[model samples]
Target: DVAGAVIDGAGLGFDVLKTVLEALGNVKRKIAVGIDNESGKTWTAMNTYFRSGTSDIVLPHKVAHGKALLYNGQKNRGPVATGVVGVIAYSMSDGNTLAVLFSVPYDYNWYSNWWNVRVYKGQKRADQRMYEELYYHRSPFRGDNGWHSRGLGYGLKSRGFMNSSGHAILEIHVTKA
Candidate 1:
């Protein structure tokens, strides 16, 4: 927990996040995110929780200008059924909240990877309703292994991509608002 500020104030740096993604090729299921917050604001981690899986990372993270926050959630592996589905939130300096979501499914037959980024009006945390908006109706981006760009509300925008495989890398940049 305390290690973040001393190192970079973000839970992890962009390079580390990328390295983890490259190493995922040998793994079966995983999801990693590096949100380069260039919104010209100090982002305080509001909270993060796994809606469907788990991670060893700490919550209520923090981020400074030009430093990206890192979040990685992985599958609760088993032969039956399990996956990593989670959300991370940050309060921007503009009095709005920014949220992100990632899902790595265990079954490839009918399920695939997905992720989303959006800016809510005020301080908010990851929860059931947030999940639905981003996961179901807020134009969540598919893990089609290519970049997707969109304008998030509150003068912010998002450009990101995710691989459809179980080993997924969801990278995003929040800028040009």
Candidate 2:
């Protein structure tokens, strides 16, 4: 009952699609990266997206695009890492180049202290919304302000829906439920 709909997020927006995915337990946690090709700027530290409802829909991981994230022997790789969930990247004329990658179930061992982990718990206060801390840290989060950071705001500014930008990326077909 919680399946079989192909929603184009570019036109329909992520709200309905996210709802359906969550209901089906297919709402994957993602490592979103915000890149500015025009400025050569990168927020290598990952952010949480797609699962946060209004927070993410309003903010959307602050990425020029999103990509599939997975393990690669000694490190993690983006869409380029193959033999995993197929990575799909696409774009809306609204300056947001989007990518959807297959995400493996959450595995504790996969993360190292070096990785900046972002855990999004829906609809909580900013401070309670995310656990933005490293693995080896003395505490869980480095700051109490919230999961949203300066880089997040900046990334959104350049990549959010209001801006007019375009790029060619991958495509995945979905059918209506």
Candidate 3:
């Protein structure tokens, strides 16, 4: 809230909206955190909730020029069922320079159905289009990197209540890209 600046008619105080806009402009990275338990006051991101696997989602291409780096844990059991449960952290940085942590400890379940804890960058259409165009192109990531980039989408089976938890340690590092 603006306090003492409403005097002398000097614009009263700083514009909160403008302040947020400027801050976003300066933000180069974002972090995501999540947990499964309700102890934490966390809200799930729209992207995760709204994504149903099929739909023509549209957004400006130029506005999409960032990357989202995530670290999730997967569970492996005998045969009854296998799932992933852990922490997830996100970091966003532009040009590998300045970075910001956006979200963290925002748990999702599969994992969060019981436990608690948790878990972008990019161009708008160009990035989205790239995703569309590359729907058939082989990915450039491999192993663990691919596990994040494409593996999550390709491999990793979800038996019953399986999911990708962030990390077991509860802390994930975020860096600027």
Candidate 4:
């Protein structure tokens, strides 16, 4: 409420607007802790929610710069019923350098369900992106839903370059039962 009212003063007067701007700038700086702690939170949640009972997902900690990494878990390669899950933890520079993706093998049909948790340099939780690939049975080219909740898995493709400032943890689970 206070922030809204202070920022609403934009049309009230010049001095008031300047004060609000300055105030927001200071807030950013004051809360800007390093990114290591941010990654820690990501790993913690990944372990608790996805990696608790299974060793299917690999835990890799490093900087991803315009490169692709796979988080595939082992399983049957044929066209039977199966599920797959994965996890990724990453930190990047200050721009758009954060993309983690997954894919499925050919011959077998599959779907994708993904949830990514992200954090800024200082904030606890920031901008998060998630997609449920529903209607995989209908469309072939643009079906957002290509992965199941578990059993079989897909190939992963991580994209982005050296210009983003944030950290993230990607977790997924697939099974055949």
Candidate 5:
């Protein structure tokens, strides 16, 4: 049976949703970006992050971090006409500053071309462990690796824990670079 909880001292509805969406308490997260082919392509790793664990997470098609990528000669990747958007997530809070992890997919529009994405936090090979719940078809994840890990390792700070009561921010820049 469901329980009764005081949501905003009233009830959750359009007001709650709008408040959650328009909250100005946003944290300016910092991202740590790494690019390497020897390790793996951005596409593969980001794909794993999004499509991994039964595709629970999905990346945005564009990002605002396009100008930098274009200057680096990686403009051919994406976010061209509309500009790229950043991947977002939360992080452990100590008072100020939230860490964010931004990743890109290795392959696009084709599953056969996968195998280029990489994981920076988990170490189980194929990054399947990160999404074991989806692999097993569990409706809800009972372990910590579900979305929590995203803030801890995948976020910009590389710290995976919810310390304070606040939303974490993750910035993901996807380009072939």
Candidate 6:
């Protein structure tokens, strides 16, 4: 059953994410995300979450109080002028916020793909500034089609991977630090 279920809340974890990533086939820009929610709180998707880039699939999906949800999306805009940029924010039961970012440029020669993860105080939703902070202000991992790991403050960390082609695949995992 690689198709049913809902994106609002009652979804699944990493394996589900990998399934979709494999389905996108090879793409100039594609991403698969899996975050383990062991923070002792439920993650509710914000209504105004953002994805400046294009993802035919859903963003900022729901994760139960204690579990993981894997998600995936492929770039569909103009291959020459458009890329994939996304910022998903979720409110946890503890009031802190969890945010993730992924950006892939259409023209690889100009720039490379990047991703970021951060924990903000209070119930903050993602916005343009947040995207830039993660995309530009912070050090980003390139879409080299390999794995990159980093520690995120607030007892969190991430391990992500991406391919080396225009049609790329990025796998990101967020867990406790």
| CA RMSD of each candidate after superposition | 3.6, 16.0, 17.7, 20.2, 17.7, 4.0
How far residue 67's Cα lies from its native spot in candidate 2, in Å, is 20
How would you encode candidate 4's per-residue C-alpha lDDT over 7-69 as one tens digit per residue?
111123323323433443321111000111221112222211222111232333442222222
Query: Number of clashes in model 1?
Result: 0
Q: List the residue pairs that clash in candidate 2.
A: 5-177, 6-175
Q: Give the TM-score of candidate 4.
A: 0.26
Q: Could you say which candidate leads in TM-score?
A: 1
CA lDDT of 165 in candidate 5?
12
Report how far off residue 104 is in candidate 6 (Å). 1.6
Flag regions of model 4 displaced more than 4 Å. 1-58, 64-71, 75-80, 85-89, 95-97, 105-129, 133-177
Candidate 4 or 3, higher lDDT: 4
Per-prediction backbone clash count? 0, 2, 62, 40, 27, 6
| Number of the candidate with higher TM-score, 3 or 5 | 5
lDDT for model 4, please.
0.24
Write down the worst ten-residue block by lDDT for model 1.
Answer: 1-10
Over 47-118, each residue of candidate 2 has an lDDT whose tens digit, in order, gives 232221211222222222232111111112343322111222333333333332222223324421111222
TM-score versus the correct structure, for each prediction: 0.84, 0.22, 0.18, 0.26, 0.19, 0.75
Which 10-residue window of candidate 5 scores lowest in summed lDDT?
Answer: 66-75
The Cα local distance difference test for each model comes to: 0.74, 0.24, 0.20, 0.24, 0.21, 0.64
lDDT by residue (tens digit), candidate 1, 11-88 = 444456666565544446777777777777788888775777666656536677777666666666565478888878
- By TM-score, the candidates rank as 1, 6, 4, 2, 5, 3
lDDT of 5: 0.21
Flag regions of model 1 displaced more than 4 Å.
Answer: 1-15, 21-27, 77-80
What lDDT does candidate 3 reach at residue 160?
12
